[PDB]
Structures are given as structure tokens and as C-alpha cells.
Amino acid sequence: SFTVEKGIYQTSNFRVQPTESIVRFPNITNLCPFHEVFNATTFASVYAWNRKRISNCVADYSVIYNFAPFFAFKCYGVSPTKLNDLCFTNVYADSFVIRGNEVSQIAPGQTGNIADYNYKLPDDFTGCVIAWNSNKLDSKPSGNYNYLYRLFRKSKLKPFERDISSPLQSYGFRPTYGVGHQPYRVVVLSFELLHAPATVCGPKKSTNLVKNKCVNFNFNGLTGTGVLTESNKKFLPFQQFGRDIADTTDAVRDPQTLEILDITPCSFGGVSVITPGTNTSNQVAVLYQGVNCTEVGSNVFQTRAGCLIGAEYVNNSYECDIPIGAGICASYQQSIIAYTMSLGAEN
Amino acid sequence: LLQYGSFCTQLKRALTGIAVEQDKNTQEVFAQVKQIYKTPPIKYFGGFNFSQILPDPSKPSKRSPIEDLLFNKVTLKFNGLTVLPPLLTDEMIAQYTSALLAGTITSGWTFGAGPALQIPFPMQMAYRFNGIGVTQNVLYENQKLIANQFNSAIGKIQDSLSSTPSALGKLQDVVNHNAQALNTLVKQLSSKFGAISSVLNDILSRLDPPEAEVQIDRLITGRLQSLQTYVTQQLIRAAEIRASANLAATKMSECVLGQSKRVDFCGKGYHLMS
Amino acid sequence: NHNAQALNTLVKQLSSKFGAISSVLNDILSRLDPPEAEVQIDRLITGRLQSLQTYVTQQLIRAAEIRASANLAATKMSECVLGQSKRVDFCGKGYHLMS
Amino acid sequence: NHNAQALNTLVKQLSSKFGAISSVLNDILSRLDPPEAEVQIDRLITGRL
Amino acid sequence: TQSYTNSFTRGVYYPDKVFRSSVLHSTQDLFLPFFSNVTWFHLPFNDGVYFASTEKSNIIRGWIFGTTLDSKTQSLLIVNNATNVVIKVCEFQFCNDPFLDVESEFRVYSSANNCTFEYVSQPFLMKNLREFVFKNIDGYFKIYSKHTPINLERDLPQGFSALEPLVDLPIGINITRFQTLLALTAGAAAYYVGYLQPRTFLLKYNENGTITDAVDCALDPLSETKCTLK
Ligand SMILES: *[C@@H]1O[C@H](CO)[C@@H](O[C@@H]2O[C@H](CO)[C@@H](O)[C@H](O)[C@H]2NC(C)=O)[C@H](O)[C@H]1NC(C)=O
Ligand SMILES: *[C@@H]1O[C@H](CO)[C@@H](O)[C@H](O)[C@H]1NC(C)=O
Ligand SMILES: *[C@@H]1O[C@H](CO)[C@@H](O)[C@H](O)[C@H]1NC(C)=O
Ligand SMILES: *[C@@H]1O[C@H](CO)[C@@H](O)[C@H](O)[C@H]1NC(C)=O
Ligand SMILES: *[C@@H]1O[C@H](CO)[C@@H](O)[C@H](O)[C@H]1NC(C)=O
Ligand SMILES: *[C@@H]1O[C@H](CO)[C@@H](O)[C@H](O)[C@H]1NC(C)=O
Ligand SMILES: *[C@@H]1O[C@H](CO)[C@@H](O)[C@H](O)[C@H]1NC(C)=O
Ligand SMILES: *[C@@H]1O[C@H](CO)[C@@H](O)[C@H](O)[C@H]1NC(C)=O
């Protein structure tokens, strides 16, 4: 509306903006054994799939694109382009060779011979599926029969189950064989989240300590913003985080030096505007609810309800006109004044 | 969230109305008189104590001993949740109560219908006895006995209040209910609602913008439902609180500013004063 | 004022999309095939059902208070107009005579 | 009358589909795959809630 | 020689590595049920094993784990001595009755073979009572320990104590059975064995952040009421 009557209205809010950024990637740099995973010239059968554990190293994935123009490059729980910014607990790499037409059979909640008899993939999978052709490397002119796959089994396989017990059928790979039958090299990576402090993460670099100010922080993947302050909490020598009744982060230890640092949110609150009728005047006053006057008309008054800006505190008493807070009212006497409400006449 | 509509305006309007009504309840109940009366310096009223209920000047907060006991016995920055202070402080309410007590002691029921008219306390008690069907000579010939009985009855009240541990359950239920509702609302923020995670920052820092919408909308719907439930519960409770405040205001008008004849309205027996 | 505001909000809620391609049923029907229309229709249906439920709940809550006020007014009419009352401050300030 | 009507309506509401394949959990679970069963169950759960 | 006794309120550890204080937390994991049989010896692994001992002469040192106990399968052989600790997963050939000669390992196993894991650090060991909790979950081997003085008693002491995590071995192999390891001349030893079960607990943290009390939500109706009321 274009006209505002006498009263107090709550319009919007406010918040203190961040100053700078802080990163704490600890110190250690290594190289993951990704070279040995690929170009090994020896890939096992699907029925006996390789399983490797990768940890305590810095994972680099540009080499994955540098390797070959992969026929398949798919990620399910994570966006493929963002794998260079995540920190993981451990990585499980499964390498084997399967037919080109059966590449689509490697998916959660999928049915197939290899799906239920060779490699059962759970519904809650978190990882990527990558496959590329290997016709020029694993196709003998007379037929490479070293690859075998199970065909008959009484019961379906469990997630991440390997059996080593004629059900087995030998694969036949020839260069004359067309698309859909040439051997493809498939690598399946499994990811773990929300576990022991992640270690496979090193692509970026760190910063230093700042305190008593609203600054973004990223402590080994713990994103957020707030104020870092010294803490008097007796951490046992093995915790890392801290919580409270609300189940939120309130403390953390620096990876470099063992020190407990409290974390508090930056200042915020509501904003209210005190004005008389627009027919009378256009002067207004602003109240910051529940905020000390230091954080924020050239006249500043502090009340229990918050910091009042633009009103002068007189020490008289009148009947209440515009309620503000705990026994404080405002009126348009010409300027805006704040006083203490009077209960009545003495008798 | 902008695509959902204007639910937030409705929630804000409901909460603001609740707060204004909460202020109005106290304003209506306690601000009955327009003059601030005072008691005489000499506290002699024909043999009656009133010290257990009159304000105590020694202590800084100026409260009666019974008010002190009640104040001590009752007992008791989030994520977008704030608590506002009441318009009237405790000292102002104490001043209202003291003015009412002084008026009813020094004037009787006359100050509740016009100018306050003085009268000796035994004569007011004789009028009140006459108002229930007993003659004045019954009071005037048993002044000391009735004064002693009144003194003992007022003395036993503090012990009766202190000994019983659940005497103030009604005033504790309000605090307990508000705390439970706020705690449930805060704790609801850790639910997944069938999403990959309950943290928006993790989803934004792990997936592409084209895909994060499917996960974000579930969280939006769940939190909107939680807020709507909280607001509805608050309105339902506020209605009952308003009804109780209206009853309290009626009782203050009828039992304190006058003598009532309604049975079991201002206590059990034949009403005299309050 | 409250009735007008509630009705205006209810009629204004019809223009929301609720995460759909369009807020008009005819536009979706004339542009998309029936196998695909249901996915977009469901969101609109759910949003409008929620709006109606909210409106009905608010109306019930207001009606309860209106009924309480009407009961009070009926008692006042019976006690201050058809007779003389001795209840203090029930029928005005002072000693009641008539209404 | 009101109590009986409310209870009858609440019990009767269990047979609605709410935009799903069927109104029985067993037939949805057996006939469909888990990745789609976990999607079909949500509509019924939300409606009953 | 077997026997039986009462577990009392023993076998509570720290579920995770998150600091808390002056709060009540509800945890769901594998724990030792209160007031249950624990066997006294003078052995299947199941879902977990609780080990407690108070022997002083250090005849007890290390344990042996395995499924078939043969060189065809990997097997944990923890060795504790006066200076360090040896952790190996290599598929050793399991002798029928392993024991330390004191220090030839021939009687423990005949040959060493293919493997990839190795860990050497301060030994686990150090009127004294020792507790150990073993569990193999999600490709990890987790071990807890705690030391506390005890008066002369034939049974478990009355009171409460918390077990702090010691090591988290990323082994992830198949375990079905286990045996104890002794160093020796005839002799005798005393120790207790308990088994873990999936339970739900209500842990209490003090202002300094250490566990001081807990309640099992499946022992009796009073405990269920306590857990529901939190
Ligand atoms: C009103 O009652 C009070 C309480 O019994 C009386 O004050 C007591 O007086 C005696 C004698 O001086 C003291 O020993 C007590 O300590 C007092 N009580 C308190 C709580 O301080 C008072 O005397 C009575 N009123 C009159 C007018 O006598
Ligand atoms: C506001 O900050 C000043 C700065 O020291 C402090 O003296 C004052 O007590 C603070 N006010 C409140 C209400 O905390
Ligand atoms: C108002 O009251 C008296 C005036 O004599 C003084 O002591 C007090 O400081 C005044 N308050 C002000 C000036 O803010
Ligand atoms: C332990 O087991 C024995 C038999 O094996 C049984 O009689 C007894 O009740 C169980 N519990 C205790 C505390 O002895
Ligand atoms: C104790 O074990 C460590 C670890 O292998 C070994 O280095 C050390 O020599 C052993 N001590 C003795 C006395 O054999
Ligand atoms: C260990 O495993 C490898 C891998 O198959 C095998 O070549 C070797 O014979 C096995 N045994 C030993 C003692 O290395
Ligand atoms: C582990 O050992 C048990 C006992 O022999 C056996 O039944 C099982 O197949 C083995 N493997 C796994 C993965 O449990
Ligand atoms: C925690 O610290 C406080 C103060 O230093 C102390 O009183 C208390 O006993 C400590 N808690 C322990 C040692 O369990």
C-alpha cells in the first residue's frame, strides 16, 4: 500500500556477511595406485573379479580422461564432474572383462545372468561405472577362451559376493566378431561416506588461523561459516568433532595443532520499523531485535528488546502509544521519543 | 521455495496475532483500576495482619513473601526461532496487585464503582457479615477471635503451598508444552524425508545443479509440513489460554471488587472477600 | 477483513506452479500427450488440496471463537436487558439500572 | 454418530490408491522391482499419514 | 575346564569419535547384555567376543583368529611381547596346538606366505583387570581395551567403566572361530569370554565428556519405560 498508519511493523531480517575463506587440507601428498589399476594387460574373468583397496593417497582423476575415450562413463550417487572436490573414506575398485552388449547389465536394481550369478550390485550403491573397449587387446584370432562366466546357480548372489566353486562357459573373442561381442574392460568403483576421517583428498591447498570474526571455514571437508574461538573442552585423545542437545557442530580440532576451537553462527536477527502515520510525518525508527548495539539517526538507545536506532530516550512518563518491549513505548511528540510507560496517577 | 506460494505470510500473520492476543490477555486481566492507591504507613487494622500479602520494602524487587515463594517455586540462538519479551514487566504487575490490595483494604468495594470512600475495617467486615445473613453484633462481640482465626488461616497458606510439590502444575504445564514443541521443531531438521542427505550444503557441494532439485524438493515439503503442524498446534493452545484468561478476569472483577452470591464461585462456603 | 483476506488468498493460490511446467490445465493438455500429463497434474492436485484443507481448518478455528462470543452476547442480553444484575462490572461500570 | 462416522471414514480410507499401481503392499512388492516398489510405497505412506 | 558366572554391568565402550557432554544419547549397536552368562575357562567367534582377564605373569599374550585355521585362508595372529606388537594376516599353516616356546614360532605355525598387511607398534598390554572387545564389521577389525584396578574378587567387579578405542584395522577377511595364545613346563590360566548381541542403549555423558552410566532398553519393563521417557 502507499499509505502506512501508526504502528510497528516487522519487515525483513539481517545477517553479517562473511569476510574471507579458510581451508585446512592437512599436509600430506601422495599418489594413488591408479596406474596399476589400468593398463595391466591382465584382467580377470567376471566370475572372479579383482578387488583392490585404495587409501592414504591423493586421488587424481584427470588421468582417467587421459586414458582413453571411454565408451561408458557413468556415475550414480555423485556427479561425475565433481569427483575432483570430494574426500572419501576408501575406494573399492573392481576390474574384469565383460561383453560389449552386457555393459548395460551392470546397474543397481537390474536383472541379468551376470547380475544374479556373477556380480550382485545392491540398490544403495554409491559409485561410478566405467567401461571401454578391449577388442584390439583381448581378442585372439582363433578365440581367447581364458574368460569364463557362470551360467547356472541355485540361488541369486548377495551384494558384494564372490563365488569360486558345466555351468562355466568359456568366452570366445575374435577380431572378426562385431560390436556387441568384443571384450570390454569394466572398472567399478565403490565409495564410502560418513565414516572415519577421510584421507583420499589432496587436490587443494590450505590457509591460516583467524579468530573472533565471521569467516568461512572448511576443515577437511566440513563446510560452513562462523566464528572460530578458543575452547575449554577436555577432548579425549581420539574424538574429532563435537555436538550438543540440538545435534549440531559446536567444536572441532585443527588437523595441524591439537586445539579445540568453538564454532558459533554469525550474528542475525529481525528488523522492525516504528513510524507514525504517513499523513503526519515520514520519520521512522528501526529496532534490531535481540542484538547488541555494537554489532550493527545518530542516536542509539539500548533496550531489553534490542537496539533502538533513531529515537531519543526521555526520562518523563506518558501513556503508551506504540509498544516496543519490556515497559518501553514510543510516541511522536517534532521528533520520535522513547520513554517508560506510566501505570496511572498516584493517589 | 518461491514457486510454492505464500504460506509464509499466513504463518507470520498467525504468529503475530497469537503474540498480540497474549499481550491483550494480561492487559485485560490485570489493568482493572486507573488509580495507584497506597497503604497508610501505620499498619493497624483492628487486629488483622496483612503483612504476608503486602509488599516488602526491604527486598529490592518489592514483593510479598507469598509472591516470592510462588516466583521461586515455578522455575523454568536456534535456527530462525526467536522468543519475544512481554510488554509488561513483573514489577508493573506487582504494582497493579499492590494497588488493588491497598484499595480493597482501605475502601472496601466502593472504589470499584466510583470514587474511593474511606471506612474502618471492622465496619466493612460488619457489612460483609450482614451480606450473608448474620447480624453485626455477632462480629462486634467476637472481634478478637475472628482476627486470630484469620491470622492463623493466612499463616498456614505458605506452609501448605510449600509442602505440596504439585500445587503449581497448571503454571508448569505451559512451560513444558512450549519447550516440547520448540524442541520437536528443532529436532525435525535432521530428518532425511527419503533423500540422500539432510544437509543442503552437502547436496549442493556433491551434485550438479540440474539434479539437486529432486533431492531439495523433498526437504522443502517435509519442513513445510512440520511448520504447518506447529502453527496449528499453537493456535489450538492459544484458544484455550484465552478462555482461561477470560475466566480469570471475570473472577477478578466479581470476587475482589465486590461480594459474590454465586455458589462455589469464589471458594467453598459463604464468600467474604478475596 | 479476515473473511476477505482468506478468500483473496485462496483465489490467489490458483496461479502457483508447484514445480510443474505450467499452471494451466488446458495448456498442458493441448501440449503434452496423456501418458505424460499425469506427472504434471498430480503436483497441482496436491497443492490445491493442501490450500483447501488449510482454508477449512482456519475457518473452523475462527467459527469456534465466534460461537463463544455469541454465547456471551446471549447471556448478556438475558441478564442485563430482561432484568437487573448484581454481578460487578458485568452490565457496565457502576451500579446497574437497566440496558 | 460423529465418533462412528469418523472411525468408519478413517478405516475406509485404507483402500485408496493415491496415484499408485495398487492399494496393497504385497502385490506392489511381489510384482514390481525394489527400485520401483520404493517409489510406489511413498504415495500410500503419505496419503495414510 | 568350563564354568559359568554373571556379567553384571560390564562391557560398555565408545560407539564413535564425537565429543559430547551433559547429554543423554541413544545408540544402536552390538553390546554385551547386562546380567548374562559369561564362560569361565582354565570357541566360535559369532558376531562378537568379549575378553576379560586379570592374570599377572604375562603367560597370556596375543590371540589367533580364523575360519578354517589353515594355510589356505588368511588368519590374524596377534603377538604381544615386552617391546612391541606384531599384527599379521598372512595365511600361516595353523598348528593344532599353538603356543610360544620362549621364542621360536615353529610350534605356532610352520611357514609364512603371501599377504599384504603388517602393523608394529606399542603392545596392547602394559590387582589389575583387562577388558577387550573384538568385532569384525564392514571390512574393518575394531579392538577396544581398558585397564582398571580390582580388589581380590572371584567374579567381575561391581561398578561401571568405559572402553576406549585402540586400533581400527582395515582387514576385512572371513573369521568364524578363534583361540587364545599362551607362552610357556605345565601351568594354568584364568579368563572370561562373553558374546555381543544387537541391542539399543541409553548412554549418559558427564560435563567432562566421559561415560558414567547406561541403560539397556530390553532387560525389563522398567528399563523400557526409562528408555521411552529418555
Ligand atoms: C503478623 O504475623 C507476623 C508473623 O507471625 C508477626 O511477626 C513476628 O513477630 C515475632 C515477634 O516480634 C517475631 O519473633 C517473628 O519473627 C515475626 N515473624 C516474621 C515472619 O518475621 C507480626 O507481629 C504479626 N503482626 C502484628 C501486628 O503483630
Ligand atoms: C553489549 O556489549 C557491551 C560491550 O562490552 C557490553 O558491555 C554489554 O553488556 C552488552 N549488552 C548486553 C545486553 O549483553
Ligand atoms: C531522568 O531522571 C533524573 C532527572 O533528574 C536523572 O537522574 C536521570 O538520569 C534522567 N535520565 C536521563 C537523563 O536519561
Ligand atoms: C547360565 O547357563 C545355565 C546353564 O547353561 C543356566 O542354568 C543359567 O540360568 C544361566 N544364567 C546364569 C546367570 O547362570
Ligand atoms: C618383540 O617384538 C618386536 C616386533 O617384532 C621385535 O622387534 C622385538 O625383537 C621383540 N622382542 C624380543 C625380545 O624378541
Ligand atoms: C599367494 O597368492 C598368489 C596370487 O594368486 C599366488 O601366485 C601364490 O602362489 C600364493 N602363495 C604364495 C606363497 O605366494
Ligand atoms: C566364511 O566362512 C564360513 C564358514 O566356513 C563360510 O560358510 C562362508 O562361506 C565364508 N565366507 C563368507 C563370505 O562368509
Ligand atoms: C572434568 O573436569 C572438572 C573440572 O576440571 C572436574 O571437576 C571433573 O572431575 C572432571 N571429570 C572427570 C575427571 O571425570
Author numbering:
A (entry chain B): 305 to 469, 490 to 620, 639 to 675, 690 to 703
B (entry chain A): 753 to 828, 854 to 1051
C (entry chain B): 953 to 1051
D (entry chain C): 953 to 1001
E (entry chain A): 25 to 66, 84 to 143, 154 to 177, 187 to 244, 259 to 304
What does the published report state?
At the end of 2022, the XBB.1.5 variant emerged, a descendant of XBB that acquired two substitutions in the spike (S) protein, S:G252V and S:F486P (S:S486P compared to XBB.1), and a translational stop in ORF8 (ORF8:G8stop). To gain structural insights into the recognition of the ACE2 receptor and evasion from neutralizing antibodies by the XBB.1.5 S protein, we performed cryo-electron microscopy (cryo-EM) analysis of both the XBB.1.5 S ectodomain alone and the XBB.1.5 S–ACE2 complex. We determine the structural basis for the interaction between human ACE2 and the S protein of XBB.1.5, showing similar overall structures between the S proteins of XBB.1 and XBB.1.5. Our recent report showed that the S486P mutation in S is a determinant of enhanced affinity to human ACE26.
The XBB.1.5 S–ACE2 complex structure was also reconstructed by cryo-EM analysis in both RBD one-up and two-up conformations, with resolutions of 3.04 Å and 3.20 Å, respectively. B Cryo-EM maps of the XBB.1.5 S protein (same colors as A) bound to human ACE2 (gray) in the one-up state (left), two-up state (middle), or RBD–ACE2 interface (right). Although the S486P substitution occurs in the ACE2 binding motif of the XBB.1.5 S protein, the overall binding mode with ACE2 was not significantly changed compared with XBB. A common feature shared by ACE2 receptors bound to the XBB.1 or XBB.1.5 S protein is that the N103-linked glycan of ACE2 is positioned towards the active site inside the ACE2 structure.
